[PDB]
């Protein structure tokens, strides 16, 4: 389908240790491909999937410089946050930053992102038009006016429609067989009595990529809503994902029920029955 590239960075202050940690991770769709950790020894951007290692020595040099610049600036931003909120350095605080772009199946630019959260709450975000900001509070409004005067939006728009998209297209070509793949789910069902009159049917999907998947239960052709339990999609650890969906059914009636499995890698949906 369409594809995304995202970098996610987390800065955390550590009173007592004394010195903050910055860690950034890079993804294409659901595949992580790089990391940088300010606490680590290398002080380098590092590969986290083999496909990115098609890149030359200059890639690692340049990417390291850029992520180190980010690390310095967001660690400075923690201190600025303290000023704007009138907070003490005695406390630990968190600054999260996400940026990146989406392209279509043919590489066309779709969307760009540049956004921050402080202590788990939205701080500031670049709007879809890539020309203005949404500030979540008074502190963020200070940043917003500053970034407006400095034309930070035009700068980001240029990156997002340029370098960001160019990089993503490049990765999709170089790592084509990894990133443009669909691994369909392997499925099975389990059954667990709850009482003498109710039992749980659980529909399992394993080994799939990308992470998006729809598991649905229906009784005689319609939804179940809050009779169905859907667990958070989870990594298997090997580059594939897992999920399950459960329904509580009347004992002896394990047949008014169907599990339909729908995934991008399935030519036709699966139908499972106990």
């Amino acid at each position: 389908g369409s594809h995304s590239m995202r970098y996610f960075s987390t800065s955390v202050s550590r009173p007592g240790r004394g010195e903050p940690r910055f860690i950034a991770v890079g993804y294409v769709d659901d595949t992580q491909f790089v990391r940088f950790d300010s606490d680590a020894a290398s002080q380098r951007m590092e590969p986290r999937a083999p496909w990115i290692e098609q890149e030359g020595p200059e890639y690692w040099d340049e990417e390291t410089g850029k992520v180190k610049a980010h690390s310095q600036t967001d660690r400075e931003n923690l201190r600025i946050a303290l000023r704007y909120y009138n907070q003490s350095e005695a406390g630990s605080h968190t600054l999260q930053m996400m940026f990146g772009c989406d392209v279509g199946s043919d590489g066309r630019f779709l969307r760009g992102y540049h956004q921050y959260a402080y202590d788990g709450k939205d701080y500031i975000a670049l709007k879809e038009d890539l020309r203005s900001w949404t500030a979540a509070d008074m502190a963020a409004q200070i940043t917003k006016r500053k970034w407006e005067a400095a034309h930070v939006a035009e700068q980001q728009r240029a990156y997002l429609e340029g370098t960001c998209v160019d990089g993503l297209r490049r990765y999709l070509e170089n790592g084509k067989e990894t990133l443009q793949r669909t691994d369909p789910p392997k499925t099975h069902m389990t059954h667990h009595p709850i009482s003498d009159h109710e039992a749980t049917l659980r529909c399992w999907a394993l080994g799939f990529y990308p992470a998006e998947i729809t598991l649905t239960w229906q009784r005689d052709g319609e939804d179940q809503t809050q009779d169905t339990e859907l667990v958070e999609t989870r990594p298997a650890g090997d580059g594939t994902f897992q999920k399950w969906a459960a329904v509580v059914v009347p004992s002896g009636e394990e047949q008014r029920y169907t599990c339909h499995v729908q995934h991008e890698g399935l030519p036709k949906p699966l139908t499972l029955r106990w």
């Binding site: 951007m45 990417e63 980010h70 704007y84 940026f99 540049h114 990156y159 990089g167």
Partner: peptide, 8 residues
């Protein structure tokens, strides 16, 4: 390919 950020 990495981008860049600004001070708050």
């Amino acid at each position: 390919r990495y981008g860049f950020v600004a001070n708050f």
